[PDB]
Amino acid sequence: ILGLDLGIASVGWAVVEIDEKENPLRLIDVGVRTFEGESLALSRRLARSARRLTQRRVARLKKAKRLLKSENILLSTDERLPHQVWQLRVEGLDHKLERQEWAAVLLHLIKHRGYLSQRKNESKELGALLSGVDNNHKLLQQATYRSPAELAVKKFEVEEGHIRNQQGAYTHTFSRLDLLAEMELLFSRQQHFGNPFASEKLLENLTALLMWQKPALSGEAILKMLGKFEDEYKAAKNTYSAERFVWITKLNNLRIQENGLERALNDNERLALMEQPYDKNRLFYSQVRSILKLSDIFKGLRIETKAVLMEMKAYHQIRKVLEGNNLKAEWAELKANPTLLDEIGTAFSLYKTDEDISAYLAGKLSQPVLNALLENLSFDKFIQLSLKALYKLLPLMQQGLRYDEACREIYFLPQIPADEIRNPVVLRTLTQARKVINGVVRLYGSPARIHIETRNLNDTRYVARFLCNFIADNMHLVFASNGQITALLNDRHHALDAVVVACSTVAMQQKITRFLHFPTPWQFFKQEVEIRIFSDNPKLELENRLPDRPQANHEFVQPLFVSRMPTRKMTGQGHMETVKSAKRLNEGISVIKMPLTKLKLKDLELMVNREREKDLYDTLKARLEAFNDDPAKAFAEPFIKKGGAIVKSVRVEQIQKSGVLVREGNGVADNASMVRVDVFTKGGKYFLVPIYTWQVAKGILPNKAATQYKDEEDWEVMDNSATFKFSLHPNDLVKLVTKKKTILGYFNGLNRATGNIDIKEHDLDKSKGKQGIFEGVGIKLALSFEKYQVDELGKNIRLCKPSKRQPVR
RNA sequence: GGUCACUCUAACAUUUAAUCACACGUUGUAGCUCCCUUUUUCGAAGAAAAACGUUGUUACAAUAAGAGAUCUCGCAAAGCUCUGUCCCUUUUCAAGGGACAUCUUUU
DNA sequence: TAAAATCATATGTGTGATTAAATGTTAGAGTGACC
DNA sequence: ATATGATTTTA
């Protein structure tokens, strides 16, 4: 049986074939495949949303500028609007603003929009942003703070010294309703004084700007995610059909445990309770204890009888909304309407946009009723039952049948279904395990059954369950153990578990659940398994340690090489997110504002104004020395320089020899990822050209290679007098022999400054190099440096020296 | 009589995927402003200036680098229909099987 | 000294919304394969 | 985990 030892980073395996199953003789080969503060896709999604919001504000302000130009407010050129936007917004309530003052006010009320609530219509502990909009909305009605700007310049700037939010404080923020109110009042008051551009057309368009935001879920969105039995769409939970399915499932499975006997409801009892929770908001247990003439003990539960069996919350929510607003007559007609009642929960759960909800109910509910439901009702669940299959399977379970009986009356390894596995870790592990399985099938045929025993334990168990079921139920051209079972009898440990997982049976697992007795399924364990996986020896040293029973080795037995996933993607993070100042980049330095709460004395020693402002440097050095070089404890209260100004962050210089120009070419950021490295030789010397992601994106092929003691401009240039060996990606199989020694392994890192490389041992033997990684390896005078190749399992070790310099982009 | 797997229901815990917004923060540029290097003019202390650094605060612009049709992609993943490069079976070619991607898809 | 191995230091963040999907456990109902 | 500058030891 394939002894797959699953995992989120590695898949160890150990092949075994047994006669009569039961007692096994000996395995064939072993292997480990090692592939690779949360999922990297979360970073991509957050960056994507940030890009979308940034460009949407770009567009919104541009559109506002065009609108203002059309009214002859914003003259074509001369777009240097006043800076004192908040003060001018305050002044507009009492004086007339000019053309450009008003233009700045409008273009600024479009930028800082506010906060528009997007909660459900399910009306009736505040955080920071919400507790700031309310605490200012409760101050805007003091009649002394007529508008958010007036409150800002009369309360915020007066006491706190700033208007905008700062340093993670979510006070000083306002709701979009308050700013729209300011828009309206400003327009009206400017009409009172005579602003020519107070056109209410402009106000309507500007409210459209300051209020429009895309709905989060628009149309098929939910449908696009609901897709994963059968095939019809899974019904909503708040649908009368699904609600009655839950009710009948409970009632039929509501066995009565009385007098030590389990008795189902006879048809009389259920007919009594069939449609009972419809005339009451909740069917309590004591309510059942009366209608059915209970002999004073249910089935489960926990005389505190006041529990809930089944409340059709959907049914009672639609009424208490429609029963109000004097819409009694429609509900009475709608009290049955089983299709109609079903179709309102199918819409309010599948579509949330008011337009999209009104579309699904194609006038089938009166628009006066539809308005009330749109304004007061929301449904957001979904059940695991096709509604089409509900109309046929629910009637049978009315009282006479059960789910199992009702359904019966209605009666190599393929690729992992990606759409059904929307989690990159699980999908990656499953696909690499599938590749390993297909490889071992090719190398051995179908060995036997399969044996699998494995902060993200959720992902691991998703992988295990899905792999077991997929393997067992899929074929083309069976055992789920656990760690406790494995423990009974470097990175190579997954092989040992593999063997132990392969030498396992369902009988021992059941005996474990019922729990010396465990035997040895081989002639000898210690020497056999010690050299089989660990201490790799191709017979020989095995044979010297295997004097007795010289029946060892197989037609293909060889030492184990841990194959590692090749990463050859050319996309990634172009540059680091800390943007700096490149105005002094020619000096070789960057200038970044450093918060005082992180200004360690090391950082203070690189301040730009060290000697320009000597008194500042002296006092800052003293206070850091007074708190043991802990800026957080040192500058925990605002620092003050000579002259009464407050110091909150100081420009600090940093050593910048290599970087990326960003922000319109104004700033510089550190290199983030090195996608590929191109090797070259000239005069018996190995020179490596590093390539970064931003170079690939811009369509740039680097020329010069790494020179240790020189800067990027003075780096050795690869030209007609250089020989191109190959490219190098992270975790690439390379062979290195030098005058010092010989090492063969994986390549994961290039040191730009020193020029050294980081080569990693296949097994990550923690007694080898810098705990498994042979870091800082010099190859300038290397005898030979060749890129190898490896298969999924750790064999077919091929090498050449072919070349074609592949152009990025 | 047990163990385990699967199907449905409810409750709890956790995790993942997609979408809509907000508020900071960084950089650049102006206005005001805290300091403080240098150099002018009036001068026998001090004032008015100019360049550079730079503290705070307001406004405006960029917020990946970049690719496309006001508007869409761009840090993730899978794969072999199209494209490109390595590897094997039967100097080049042709078939078979596979590996990775700068190719396609999610989009 | 050139090249090489060692060490050492730094990485953008919090708030507020609509949803779907998966795993594990417990409670209830059941079928099916193996001890 | 990755990029890489500062510093020590080695050929």
Side-chain angles (χ1 to χ4, degrees), chain A residues 113-122 126-137 139-153 155-203 205-219 221-227 231-233 235-249 251-257 260-261 263-268 271-275 277-278 281 283-292 295-296 298 300-301 305:
Chain A
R113 299 223 282 186
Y115 150 71
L116 204 60
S117 196
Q118 295 176 296
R119 294 180 174 178
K120 318 178 186 184
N121 52 29
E122 281 280 319
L126 274 180
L129 208 58
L130 266 280
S131 178
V133 300
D134 283 307
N135 195 15
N136 293 333
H137 167 272
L139 284 170
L140 284 184
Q141 62 183 14
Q142 279 203 1
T144 76
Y145 310 117
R146 301 171 299 185
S147 71
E150 221 209 346
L151 163 65
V153 198
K155 181 58 181 177
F156 296 162
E157 191 271 325
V158 171
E159 180 57 40
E160 266 185 64
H162 49 116
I163 308 190
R164 283 267 293 265
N165 302 14
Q166 281 187 163
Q167 315 286 181
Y170 298 95
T171 172
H172 300 239
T173 199
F174 308 99
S175 54
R176 214 162 305 186
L177 313 174
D178 289 346
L179 269 60
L180 175 144
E182 212 180 12
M183 185 89 68
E184 307 193 322
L185 209 166
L186 275 168
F187 266 71
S188 87
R189 179 80 77 268
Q190 284 290 323
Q191 302 178 5
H192 180 269
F193 299 116
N195 206 37
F197 328 93
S199 304
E200 284 254 348
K201 318 94 178 179
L202 179 68
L203 173 141
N205 290 245
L206 282 181
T207 55
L209 271 305
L210 175 69
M211 291 282 302
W212 179 89
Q213 61 193 26
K214 290 187 46 179
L217 295 175
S218 64
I222 308 87
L223 271 181
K224 299 183 61 174
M225 303 187 290
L226 195 150
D231 213 20
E232 193 36 80
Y233 99 100
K237 169 190 303 185
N238 293 297
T239 280
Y240 188 113
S241 308
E243 279 208 314
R244 203 142 161 212
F245 175 99
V246 176
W247 179 217
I248 68 187
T249 302
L251 206 59
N252 309 9
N253 303 299
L254 245 179
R255 297 294 132 81
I256 309 179
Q257 185 182 9
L261 314 170
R263 34 181 280 270
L265 295 186
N266 55 346
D267 285 26
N268 289 337
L271 283 180
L273 270 59
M274 179 90 57
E275 303 301 59
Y278 300 69
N281 294 4
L283 181 41
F284 280 51
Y285 176 62
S286 54
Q287 300 190 3
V288 183
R289 208 180 182 94
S290 311
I291 313 182
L292 292 197
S295 55
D296 312 350
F298 47 86
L301 294 174
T305 291

Side-chain angles (χ1 to χ4, degrees), chain A residues 314-332 334-370 372-374 376-384 386-387 389-401 403-407 410 413-418 420-428:
Chain A
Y315 180 91
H316 300 287
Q317 291 186 13
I318 314 145
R319 56 168 286 265
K320 298 188 294 288
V321 165
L322 284 188
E323 192 195 89
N325 322 56
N326 199 6
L327 301 180
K328 306 276 194 57
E330 190 46 40
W331 178 59
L334 181 89
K335 288 170 73 173
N337 299 180
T339 57
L340 284 71
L341 279 184
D342 280 335
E343 301 326 291
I344 80 185
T346 299
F348 279 73
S349 305
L350 202 170
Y351 294 132
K352 275 68 162 47
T353 312
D354 281 10
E355 148 192 325
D356 302 342
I357 300 192
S358 315
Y360 182 95
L361 292 325
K364 332 198 321 190
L365 272 193
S366 39
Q367 295 191 7
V369 154
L370 199 52
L373 294 180
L374 278 172
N376 269 3
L377 196 54
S378 171
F379 285 140
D380 57 335
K381 312 322 308 303
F382 258 109
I383 209 64
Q384 329 299 347
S386 305
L387 195 66
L390 268 181
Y391 292 102
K392 68 187 52 179
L393 198 149
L394 165 140
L396 331 172
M397 318 166 56
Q398 199 69 199
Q399 175 47 206
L401 285 180
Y403 179 81
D404 45 303
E405 291 145 89
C407 182
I410 297 169
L413 201 44
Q415 72 174 8
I416 292 77
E420 314 182 20
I421 318 291
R422 294 186 174 187
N423 174 201
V425 179
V426 170
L427 172 54
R428 200 173 198 86

Side-chain angles (χ1 to χ4, degrees), chain A residues 60-71 73-74:
Chain A
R60 182 171 57 250
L61 295 168
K62 177 181 315 181
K63 182 190 199 71
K65 292 181 179 179
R66 313 320 150 191
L67 171 59
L68 287 186
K69 174 176 304 177
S70 68
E71 183 145 309
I73 313 183
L74 204 162

Side-chain angles (χ1 to χ4, degrees), chain A residues 446-452 456-476 479-483 485-487 490-491 493-494:
Chain A
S446 301
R449 42 201 290 95
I450 302 80
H451 275 46
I452 314 180
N456 222 352
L457 73 172
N458 294 16
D459 287 10
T460 74
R461 299 180 299 193
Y462 192 167
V463 177
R465 185 190 174 280
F466 193 81
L467 183 62
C468 296
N469 308 345
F470 190 96
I471 283 178
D473 313 328
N474 295 328
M475 35 72 61
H476 166 279
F479 189 37
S481 182
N482 89 322
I485 294 169
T486 68
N490 69 0
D491 285 11
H493 50 284
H494 303 280

Side-chain angles (χ1 to χ4, degrees), chain A residues 681 683-709 711 714-734 736-738 742-751:
Chain A
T681 85
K685 307 175 166 204
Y686 272 109
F687 274 57
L688 276 73
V689 170
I691 305 190
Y692 301 92
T693 316
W694 65 273
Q695 300 159 347
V696 174
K698 278 172 68 49
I700 284 178
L701 181 143
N703 315 280
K704 322 183 170 265
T707 304
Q708 175 170 351
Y709 287 90
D711 294 330
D714 312 340
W715 264 17
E716 201 46 90
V717 48
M718 300 306 93
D719 52 1
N720 304 115
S721 67
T723 70
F724 175 66
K725 302 288 99 174
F726 43 80
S727 306
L728 290 174
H729 307 71
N731 286 303
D732 272 345
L733 197 59
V734 294
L736 182 58
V737 302
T738 58
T742 75
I743 297 174
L744 326 177
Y746 280 107
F747 171 66
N748 59 7
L750 171 62
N751 188 334

Side-chain angles (χ1 to χ4, degrees), chain A residues 567 569-607:
Chain A
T567 58
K569 63 185 184 304
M570 302 280 90
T571 65
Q573 196 174 37
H575 60 68
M576 306 297 326
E577 292 204 310
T578 46
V579 191
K580 285 168 285 186
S581 174
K583 294 201 293 216
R584 308 168 55 183
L585 207 51
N586 52 82
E587 306 198 51
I589 54 172
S590 76
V591 185
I592 182 169
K593 274 221 269 173
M594 264 277 296
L596 276 192
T597 68
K598 292 179 289 284
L599 195 64
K600 195 172 290 294
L601 198 149
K602 171 174 76 211
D603 302 329
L604 176 52
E605 293 293 326
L606 263 53
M607 189 179 176

